[PDB]
């Protein structure tokens, strides 16, 4: 079996962003982010934490597309969505987000694990590909 | 701050494969794999563990990266390599593998963290693109 420090290093090594949020009312707030999430978003740890992750969505709220996510979180189901998000510097990316409910023995709190991934390149590739297929 | 159970949930939730290996002679053997690594490779934990991970490489001896990885592991450097691997069922996939040395302050032994990303899709998209551009 594997100890806590190794688990930390497994998260720290990970390519995808990983985060944990605890529920605060009908919102969540980030309590942990890994290094890859910092790099992905352009924000430092200290800028990100203790806030709901929707700030990444920017000043726009899409069409409250997060409907599916809020449905799933409320219901205690995982989900995955691709969302528009914006780095610190304003540059936009497509973020493939997988959210996973956690059941906590230790306290009474509700936690969620998020795994996040830049999929811009792949979105663009599918687009370029469909364009050439159309020629 | 973050506890051990949630770290385990972060690794369990991970989309990429995560694994820990030990040195044994001039081999390394897996001692932990997450669920995603099962899915990725098609093998169960009990089939995988306690073996050097090169069996995934199949009948296809690469050279190139293997040397590079041995070099890097010996030297105690993290390293990253793309390599063809084969699931249980024979189907091939492109694995972006990053290996990270860590020393356990618990038992003073050095452990290797492996992160495995399936990058088949991107690779195939670039392939399909380069083919249509060739038309
Ligand atoms: Ni042995």
Q: Could you report how far apart the first and last alpha carbons of chain B are, in Å? A: 56
| Spacing of C-alpha A110 from chain mean position | 17
**With b meaning 16 or more CB within 10 Å and e meaning fewer, what string describes B64-93?**
ebeeebeebbeeeeebbbebebbeeeeeeb
Q: Do A126 and B121 touch (CB under 8 A)?
A: no
Using alpha carbons, list the distances in angstroms from residue B18 to A128, B31, B64, B94, B100.
Answer: 32, 11, 23, 16, 11
Experimental method: X-ray
Q: How far is the CA of B60 from the centre of ligand 1 (A)?
A: 24
Q: At B29, is the secondary structure helix, strand, or coil?
A: strand
DSSP 8-state class, residue A36: H
**Which residues neighbour B59 within 8 Å (Cβ) at sequence distance 6 or greater?**
none
From the list B8, B14, B105, the residue facing A5 with the nearest CB is: B105
Q: What is the resolution of this structure in A?
A: 2.4
Q: How far is the CA of A31 from the centre of ligand 1 (A)?
A: 41
B134, B110 Cβ separation under 8 angstroms: no
In whole angstroms, what is the distance from residue A78 CA to residue A101 CA?
Answer: 6
Using alpha carbons, list the distances in angstroms from residue A59 to A46, A56, A117, B76, B129.
Answer: 21, 9, 21, 45, 35
**Which residues neighbour B22 within 8 Å (Cβ) at sequence distance 6 or greater?**
B28, B29, B31, B109, B111, B112
* Residue A127 burial (10 A CB sphere; 0-12, 13-18, 19+): exposed
Domain at B4-134, CATH homologous superfamily = PAS domain (3.30.450.20)
Q: Do A7 and B3 touch (CB under 8 A)?
A: no
Q: Which residue in B108, B41, B25, A30 sits closest to B33, CA to CA?
A: B41
Task: State residue B64 phi and psi, 5-degree precision.
Answer: 45, -95
| Spacing of C-alpha B24 from chain mean position | 17
In whole angstroms, what is the distance from residue A46 CA to residue A50 CA?
Answer: 9
Q: Binding site annotation covers B8?
A: no
Q: For residue A121, list chain B residues with Cβ-Cβ distance below 8 A.
A: 122
B35, A131 Cβ separation under 8 angstroms: no
From the list A13, A106, A126, the residue facing B113 with the nearest CB is: A13
B113, A2 Cβ separation under 8 angstroms: no
- Give kind and range of the element (H or E) at residue B122: helix B120-134
Compare all CA atoms of chain B with the CA of A105 and give the residue at the minimum distance: B5
Q: At B92, is the secondary structure helix, strand, or coil?
A: strand
């Amino acid at each position: 079996m594997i100890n806590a420090q190794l688990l930390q290093s497994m998260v720290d090594a990970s390519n995808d962003g990983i985060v944990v949020a605890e529920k605060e009312g009908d919102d969540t707030i980030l309590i942990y982010v890994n290094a890859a999430f910092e790099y992905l978003t352009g924000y430092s740890r200290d800028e990100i934490l203790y806030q709901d992750c929707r700030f990444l969505q920017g000043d726009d709220a899409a069409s409250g597309a997060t409907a599916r996510i809020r449905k799933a979180m409320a219901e205690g189901r995982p989900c995955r969505e691709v969302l528009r998000n914006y780095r610190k510097d304003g540059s936009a990316f497509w973020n493939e987000l997988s959210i996973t409910p956690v059941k906590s023995d230790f306290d009474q709190r509700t936690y969620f694990i998020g795994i996040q991934k830049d999929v811009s390149r792949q979105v663009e590739l599918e687009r370029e590909l469909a364009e050439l297929r159309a020629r």
